[model samples]
Target: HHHHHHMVHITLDRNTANSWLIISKDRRQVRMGDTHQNVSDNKERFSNYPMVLGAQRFSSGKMYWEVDVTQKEAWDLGVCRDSVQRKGQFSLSPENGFWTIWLWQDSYEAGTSPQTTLHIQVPPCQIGIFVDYEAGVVSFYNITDHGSLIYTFSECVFAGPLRPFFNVGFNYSGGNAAPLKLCPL
Candidate 1:
């Protein structure tokens, strides 16, 4: 069941990344930097959050991608609308065009309007994300647990192209410096 969807290659788009994020040379990894890098502040760039977008965009069809979250204590992973708010403060919820799940302080939560808490038998080191454009579905899987489901968002109506979303939460005194890596297909 996990191998049903077509796997797609994803890379970090530096242009849409916040200044404080450091994208790897291959654009397959992203992490928080101590200092902001010198880059043009375009509208696509995230101005206030430590977030980045994937280079590929999808408007239709089913797509699957995986991320290595091993040893990461604080991070967010999922997909968002290409036209989502990149500047200033915004809630990371479906209403704000983000369908994500995050780990913080040993807690797992879905980025829903009311925020859904998740309890897993085993913490996932790798996460698999599957999106069905026409079906309006987005699901997260715990790859470390035999690809068990973590959560799913249904009845979504994506208006524009959707981009893979990543957020390396606060550094937390060097507690969460591990890079969020895109798994090679």
Candidate 2:
């Protein structure tokens, strides 16, 4: 499929970021900071995780965006409800308003209610996320490997708007400090 046609430019929304997350000046990259930065507390800002959302929101139609995850040992990418929990701890799953896939240690897993493990022949340097809001589908593709299918969440009952989700993961001894960069259109 020609995924590029649905590609949309996405930038990180600093206001929605966790204080421990550092958003690049261009707003195209985000990573965990060693120290929390001073920021106002807001309903939209994430408080319990090193995460952020894209500034763009979609309520209908197909939307696509890619992120550079190269060299990152842990991260999360996908989409979530605009109103997904911002405070307190919560699981990253559809029931929790998150349709994401994450890399933890050396394993890749889909953020399903029980979580599904994925095995890919090659680790992706870049990943593409696609959403068909009306069709209730969210899919991740390994762009580094001929855009092969990674995993998908279907029959999602998305409510309201949805935003591109990102998580650079905790910077454990700087092992996961690499930024999750929004790929250019």
Candidate 3:
């Protein structure tokens, strides 16, 4: 039934731009986007639905996430241009560990580099960095940085939590850090 008894489901709403719906396995919702709440939503619209899970926490290994984006062309998932959010909390860190974070079906058009790939290579460990929440930056050690940037977004709302937030889910492809596997050494 493709049912992950230990998985969490997060629903995202349209926040216009730079919105995210972060879903942690632990069930802690933290909104990530430009406006904080309806009161602060003076620049745009408002709703209880989050662009990003309000600091949702979860654990995974060698997996990929799927999210429902408000803006498709802009949702070229990955780290952000600035040094915000991308953390080590969702991985096995150390000097000798390997973690690969990638966003698929996400497109990165020309003249736009809103998102980026984050990679930490070595082998055997754990790593997780908590996003500043307010400071939306893109800082990852290693990334699938193999493309171009199109349509630069000029706004405080950056490209993370994957801007234009939506449903974010991940899966394990296979490797040393593959879900529920001992450190491969």
Candidate 4:
């Protein structure tokens, strides 16, 4: 399949963001909330997970978006099908409907079905996520270095209406305090 590189404007869905995650009023940038708000508990609200889903959804075609993770000590980025579990604790794996890439302990990792350890030497401050549902592939890139490929999830089950997903992991002291901003195209 021929890939047409393009940018897709997306924003965070406040309704799906966890109480500990602060989604900007404009719904574009998200960061670790200063203090957990006692918002209405809902299935869409990640119980204790610091994550959020994008407002846009794509069933077909190539979708691309970027997240600015600069200075964040821990974070995760990827996409999830509309029906993926959003309540309680869940696995960030493909079989669980999560095809994501994340950074922890200064290393990047891909969240495949069984998960994969990616040998990413340079920490990706900015990440680009591209999904080609028809091809059953999702690719991650180090956008900070000119769109260098970091990893790819093959044979993804792209059920219609996949939503862009992101997380800053759990807040520890002052770590993971940087806002995961959705870059303007």
Best by lDDT: 1
Candidate 3 residue spans exceeding 4 A from truth:
1-7, 11-38, 41-51, 59-65, 69-71, 76-185
* Tens digit of per-residue lDDT, candidate 4, span 66-150: 8899888888899998998877667788778888988888777788756688976667778888888799989988776767788
| After superposition, candidate 2 runs with Cα above 4 Å error | none
Give TM-scores for every candidate, taking all chains together and pairing residue i with residue i: 0.96, 0.97, 0.23, 0.92
What does candidate 1's lDDT look like per residue over 1-185, in tens digits?
A: 45535899899999999988899999999988888788778888888778999999999999999999888889999999999998889989988899999998889999998999998999999999999999999999999998999999999978889999999888866778889999988
True lDDT of residue 77, candidate 2: 89
User: Model 3 — TM-score against the truth?
Assistant: 0.23
Winner on TM-score (1 vs 4): 1
lDDT (Cα, 0-100) at 70 in candidate 1: 85
- Count backbone overlaps in model 2: 0
The 0-to-1 C-alpha lDDT of every candidate, in the order given, reads 0.91, 0.90, 0.25, 0.82
**What's the C-alpha lDDT at position 37 in model 3?**
31
Candidate 4 regions exceeding 4 Å error are 1-4
For model 2 the local lDDT of residue 137 reads 95
